Amino acid sequence: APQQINDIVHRTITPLIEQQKIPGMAVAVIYQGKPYYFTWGYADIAKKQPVTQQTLFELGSVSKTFTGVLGGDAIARGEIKLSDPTTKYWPELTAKQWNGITLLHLATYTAGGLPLQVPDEVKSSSDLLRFYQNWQPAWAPGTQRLYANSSIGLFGALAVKPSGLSFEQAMQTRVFQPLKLNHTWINVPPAEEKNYAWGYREGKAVHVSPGALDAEAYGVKSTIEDMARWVQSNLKPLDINEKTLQQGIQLAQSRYWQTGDMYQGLGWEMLDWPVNPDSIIALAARPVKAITPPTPAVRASWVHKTGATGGFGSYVAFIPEKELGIVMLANKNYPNPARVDAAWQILNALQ
Numbered sequence: 001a002p003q004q005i006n007d008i009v010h011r012t013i014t015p016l017i018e019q020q021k022i023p024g025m026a027v028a029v030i031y032q033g034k035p036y037y038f039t040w041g042y043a044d045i046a047k048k049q050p051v052t053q054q055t056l057f058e059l060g061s062v063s064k065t066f067t068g069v070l071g072g073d074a075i076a077r078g079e080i081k082l083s084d085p086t087t088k089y090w091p092e093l094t095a096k097q098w099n100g101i102t103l104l105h106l107a108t109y110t111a112g113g114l115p116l117q118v119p120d121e122v123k124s125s126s127d128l129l130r131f132y133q134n135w136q137p138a139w140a141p142g143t144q145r146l147y148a149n150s151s152i153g154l155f156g157a158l159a160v161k162p163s164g165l166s167f168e169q170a171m172q173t174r175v176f177q178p179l180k181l182n183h184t185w186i187n188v189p190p191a192e193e194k195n196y197a198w199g200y201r202e203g204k205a206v207h208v209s210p211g212a213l214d215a216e217a218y219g220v221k222s223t224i225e226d227m228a229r230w231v232q233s234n235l236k237p238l239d240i241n242e243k244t245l246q247q248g249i250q251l252a253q254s255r256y257w258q259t260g261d262m263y264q265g266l267g268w269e270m271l272d273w274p275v276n277p278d279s280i281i282a283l284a285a286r287p288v289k290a291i292t293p294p295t296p297a298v299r300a301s302w303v304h305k306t307g308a309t310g311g312f313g314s315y316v317a318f319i320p321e322k323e324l325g326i327v328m329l330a331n332k333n334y335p336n337p338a339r340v341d342a343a344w345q346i347l348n349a350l351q
């Protein structure tokens, strides 16, 4: 890699890894549209396996960006509409609080207070229905944002219903395969297990546990090369052959709501570029202003998403206008501000 990229990356990441005590990390910088890879440490401390360009890391919430683009693709196909009532795709959702809650609200955490987590006891299809039927909103739809897996997770599950495919089948065939993400999985195949890094939480090796709507809200596992390719696709959607996929990417980067300096897309979150790095809590309810109608993907934006699981910590950020981006995958869930600080240090130096 160009010495400049080599230098800002190592000078920024090496101190981060030791300050946060990260067992292993992989980073990709997309510069002028080309990827440059870097890796450090261990994928498996006990087995002394290093982190490589083929190592799989749990993406946690960065998985929501795939869910948003898949939903976007379904909209482009004419299979669903964001303006459609949730009950249209789930008829047995007869409880009256749902009148008025659209797929848009579900996709953007604006349904009225759906919880961050789907309860651990919800572990069956009927359990899931019971849960949503009994949920009591705190607010009217389209008034406040409360980040939630029970919200975008449900959007993902309903978005693929017309297709008839399971969420994993639709993700593989409509998003992973067309984009050549051949080492990105919702469920890691035994063939790829030797590359699946262990997560580390308080010194213990851990992998994400199964849970309702896990696939849809935080279940993707991927490599630094496939994530670099995911960023390239999002940086230049118009370069994608598949028409509905190309449009689905643009729809996921459209600005539906605003809270402070941040704009909510489908999965992705955006801020106007240049951004104040300062501008880039277990539960934060924030009033949102509707963007009517939604602003189409803005090239001068810092588009990003943080993600975590018990044992992993991820971050992706890119700036379309500069053909610039970064992916940071670690097998330790460490503070988000540390992620964003290192990302900005690197991208600001290269812009």
Ligand SMILES: O=C(O)c1ccc(NS(=O)(=O)c2ccsc2C(=O)O)c(O)c1
Pocket: 059, 060, 061, 062, 116, 149, 208, 217, 218, 306, 307, 308, 309, 310, 311
């Ligand atoms: O077990 C855990 O501590 C744990 C933490 C996050 C997580 N991933 S998550 O549910 O998508 C999430 C909740 C709040 S933030 C995030 C995120 O990804 O940034 C998960 O599936 C398990």
